[PDB]
């Protein structure tokens, strides 16, 4: 939850109300996504990451 809350906060702060900040956080999150996609790793229904 420490990251679900952070992502929701950053998205609500970038979309809707506009702040030049909260795009660095989105950048970090997208960087993590791009890290995850370097190596394929299957996950079933209970393990969706």
């Amino acid at each position: 939850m420490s990251d679900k809350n952070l992502l929701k906060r950053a998205l609500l702060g970038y979309s809707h109300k506009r702040q030049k900040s909260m795009l660095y956080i989105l950048g970090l999150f997208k960087f993590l996504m791009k890290l995850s996609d370097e190596t394929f790793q299957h996950e079933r229904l209970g393990q969706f990451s």
């Binding site: 109300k17 506009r18 702040q19 030049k20 900040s21 795009l23 660095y24």
Partner: protein, 48 residues
């Protein structure tokens, strides 16, 4: 009232948060700043 006059509260054009990569609370008052302070701080410490 002063935020309405200069438009620095969230919603009008001169709001810094849409232009600076930092929170409203962490913005200098000379720029679009949040002047929200307690009266006790405003009375003992000062204005700035």
């Amino acid at each position: 009232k002063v935020e309405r006059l200069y438009g620095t509260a969230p919603g009008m054009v001169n709001h810094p948060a849409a232009y600076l990569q930092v929170k409203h609370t962490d913005t200098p008052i000379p720029l679009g700043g949040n002047g929200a302070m307690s009266i006790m701080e405003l009375a003992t410490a000062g204005i700035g």
